[PDB]
From Swiss-Prot, chain A:
UniProt EC number: 6.1.1.11
Annotated positions binding Zn(2+): 296, 345, 436
Subunit structure: Homodimer.
Binding site for L-serine: 294, 326, 343-345, 410
InterPro entries: aa-tRNA-synth_II (IPR006195), aa-tRNA-synth_II/BPL/LPL (IPR045864), Ser-tRNA-ligase_2_arc (IPR004503), SerS_tRNA-bd (IPR041293)
Sequence positions that bind ATP: 326-328, 337-338, 407, 443
Regulation (activators, inhibitors): Inhibited by serinamide, unlike type-1 M.barkeri SerRS.
Biological role: Catalyzes the attachment of serine to tRNA(Ser). Is also probably able to aminoacylate tRNA(Sec) with serine, to form the misacylated tRNA L-seryl-tRNA(Sec), which will be further converted into selenocysteinyl-tRNA(Sec).
Protein name from the UniProt record: Type-2 serine--tRNA ligase
Length: 477, 487
């Protein structure tokens, strides 16, 4: 990358009640003392913050690197002066950060950034920041945002862990097409949405039974019920509020229950037989969030701001109380790529060691299920130390010998992300980790039916015993 | 005052209708006793008041009652002129243009100012209301004046008679029971770590203890009701679009109670960078800016739950062998903007329902309803052992409601509604255009099991201590799981 030094520069003056004249001697010497003592704390040798110069007002220029940054050193200076002047005897002029980068960057529509100029070694930012913004650690977040943008300009890494021996593929139809023709399901009215008739529902329910009996029970997972409408509060706390916006379906409550407010809408429909979506948008409130997207984030409201007794971890829970929603890539797909899906979401919390242990245990169960019960062809891969996702992929014969495999299962180790995000401590004081694993029912079905067909006689014995006698569908004329 | 229509319009012509001022004038005068009398009792019938020509314009003023309305009257005079001037004059019409469309509607009272799509102004006058309409030729053929008239008459007759909508008749009531537990059950559950409030309005997160109770109820419904009556599981959609609610009749008035769903105007990350950057710097989500950036709503979150199912049978014909179609869904949450104030689980904005739906002939649909009551009776008396009643709310079209007392509410508090069986008549087959092979009328019913409602009633009556729950219920529950304890 670039080796240009990360530099902060601050020019401001302290608000003084009394006139800086008898203090002239006292202020000069204790700035010197701050340079050798106070501003060293929290920085490797020599890399401490520094006051370059100082002149009604007490104006100064202040310089730092990445440690003891200018905007937090000034508060260290504010408290030291307070005890020096008060008992005996902040207005910012400029804020500049210099940030290392190879490539040029665009001008950003970002709050608190007055100007952005490209320089030798990277970018120079000028911040529109006062006292409150500094206390709120705004420049740290601008730096973080800018660093994210910088390394993104420098632009997947996929690593194979285990693969099953190839098997024969006597069935080559698209299971969705097959299911449609045989009366298993139909397209729902919304995009990427399906209505499942008795036969398809049965498959979904049998996978559910499999997860419960072969995984969730033997490992001691307890059922909870997670909320499905998800608020900004949750997504702020989970981090989804940093970028999830393009993928979600937004939710708006009505501004009021008042019949009269809504009369114009009902009236419009009565006369035109058209829904006035334009007018309705005006009358609905701002979005409160969206429909369930990742599924686990809203659970963390259950433990938010709490301390778990060591007795209570590992916490091992799951949810299967409703639907998830994602705005997928346009153009139609089958059940392999839906907008409305049904997931069993599995969440575990404990120490670092316990989370890794739990992940490994789930991996063993998935292997048993896919090999011995479903008897499908699959592999797993890690996406590029233990923090990250392991993906399960399977070939869909109808896509041909060279087609993309389908992602149908995940296990994620999330580190301290969620405990930190939702503020969940452990009573012993050790750092809490978490993990999660989502069983996408549509995906299991897409994989199993593409490989095995819609005919129970050709399904593995172990699967047939769990389905029972298939129900009949709804026959039409 | 009397109901009357008023039209001012002219026929467009290719060539000038000038060489026909006598053949045309003799024709209009005839229509006032002949052409514009059919379909209306004598004395009543459309009439032309003013006559005027031009080099292309043939403007007329027409007045009528509700019989042979002015816009039907102009279509009688359209083809009459098309053959009188057809090959005998070489002049054909090119269309109809309207200057004014004015309607006088009788009303004893004064009525508020409403904004209505094709009404360009309304005023209160001597005998009722006047409506100035903004209609062309297309709007007249489509019955726009007729639907507007219909709308205003609905409002005039509602203002006169009020809002009479409460038909309640008790059917059966269990004998009073000893109520040893008088605590609000969700307040108890909160205190005992069974659940916590979710971030969203009227929303709850259920710890293992509460989830167990929900799943025990679900198990009971499956085993004691769905299986022995031969119901088949399906999976109904949960994002519900306008087209679905248009066909179910919800597009007529659910608006105040629904949670609206909006897609992003685009998937394009560059469009959303400003939102993301704003959040990352301020730690405030810019909800006002997001509202500008999302699309108009495509529908809402699941409200009644069965409507999205009907797209499965929409426009199909069912062989007589296939009926009754007995079906149920338990695939996710329903959402509703409830009347305000915080409540416990007895009244939530996010709930968990099992929606049971049956379709067949009128007789089969009554039969199926009858089959469910017997099963509900058995469940509520012999498993849950709760104090309950049921009542019809309004011949056979209507809902039977189950209510139970909540001891904490007092000796005369409101009983809680916790179960329903609805007979909807032909409403759903008609709205979704679903037919029977034999041509006999299809009917449907539904029954929604609200888990929060069952829990509220059961837990308020029997407490949270398993030792006090009925023997039948305890066996199905099994061993209670422990909760998650915080320091
Ligand atoms: Cl989510
Ligand atoms: Cl609905
Ligand atoms: Pt015509
Ligand atoms: Zn998760
Ligand atoms: Zn229903």
């Amino acid at each position: 990358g670039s080796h240009m030094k990360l530099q902060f520069n601050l020019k401001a003056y302290f608000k003084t009640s009394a006139d800086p004249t008898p203090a002239k001697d006292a202020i000069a010497a204790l700035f010197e003392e701050a340079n050798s003592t106070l501003l060293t704390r929290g920085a490797p040798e020599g890399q401490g913050a520094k006051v370059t110069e100082w002149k009604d007002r007490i104006e100064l220029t202040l310089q730092s690197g990445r440690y003891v940054r200018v905007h937090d050193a000034i508060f260290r200076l504010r408290k030291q002066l307070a005890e020096a002047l008060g008992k005996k005897y902040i207005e910012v002029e400029s804020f500049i950060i210099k940030v290392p980068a190879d490539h040029e960057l665009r001008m950003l529509k970002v709050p608190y950034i007055k100007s952005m100029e490209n320089i030798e070694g990277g970018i120079q930012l000028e911040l529109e920041v006062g006292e409150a913004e500094m206390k709120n650690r705004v420049p740290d977040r601008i730096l973080t945002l800018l660093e994210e943008k910088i390394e993104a300009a420098q632009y997947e890494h996929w690593n194979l862990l285990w693969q099953r021996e190839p098997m024969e593929h006597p069935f080559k139809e698209d299971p969705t097409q097959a299911m449609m023709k045989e009366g298993w399901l139909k397209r729902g009215s919304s995009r990427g949405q399906w209505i499942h008739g008795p036969q398809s529902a049965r498959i979904f329910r049998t996978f559910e039974k499999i997860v419960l009996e072969e995984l969730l029970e033997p490992l001691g997972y307890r059922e909870m019920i997670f909320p499905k409408l998800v608020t900004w509060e949750v997504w702020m706390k989970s981090g989804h509020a940093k970028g999830v916006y393009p993928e979600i379906y937004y939710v708006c409550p009505p501004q009021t229950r008042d019949p009269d407010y809504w009369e114009e809408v009902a009236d419009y429909y009565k006369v035109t037989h058209e829904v006035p979506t334009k007018l309705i948008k005006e009358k609905i409130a701002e979005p409160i969030g969206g429909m369930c997207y990742a599924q686990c984030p809203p659970f963390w409201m259950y433990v938010a701001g709490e301390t778990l007794p060591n007795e209570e971890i590992p916490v091992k829970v799951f949810d299967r109380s409703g639907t998830s929603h994602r705005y997928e890539s346009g153009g139609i797909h089958g059940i392999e790529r839906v907008d409305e899906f049904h997931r069993i979401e599995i969440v575990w919390i404990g120490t670092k060691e316990e989370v890794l242990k739990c992940a490994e245990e789930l991996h063993d169960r998935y292997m048993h299920i896919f090999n011995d019960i479903l008897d499908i062809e699959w592999r797993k891969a890690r996406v590029t130390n233990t923090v990250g996702t392991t993906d399960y992929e399977a070939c869909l014969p109808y896509r041909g010998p060279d087609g993309e495999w389908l992602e149908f299962q995940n296990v994620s180790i999330n580190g301290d992300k969620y405990p930190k995000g939702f503020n969940v401590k452990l009573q012993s004081g050790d750092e809490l980790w978490s993990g999660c694993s989502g069983v996408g029912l549509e995906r299991w079905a897409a994989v199993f039916l593409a490989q095995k067909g819609l005919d129970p006689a050709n399904w593995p014995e172990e699967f047939r015993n769990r389905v029972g006698e298939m129900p009949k569908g709804i026959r039409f004329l």
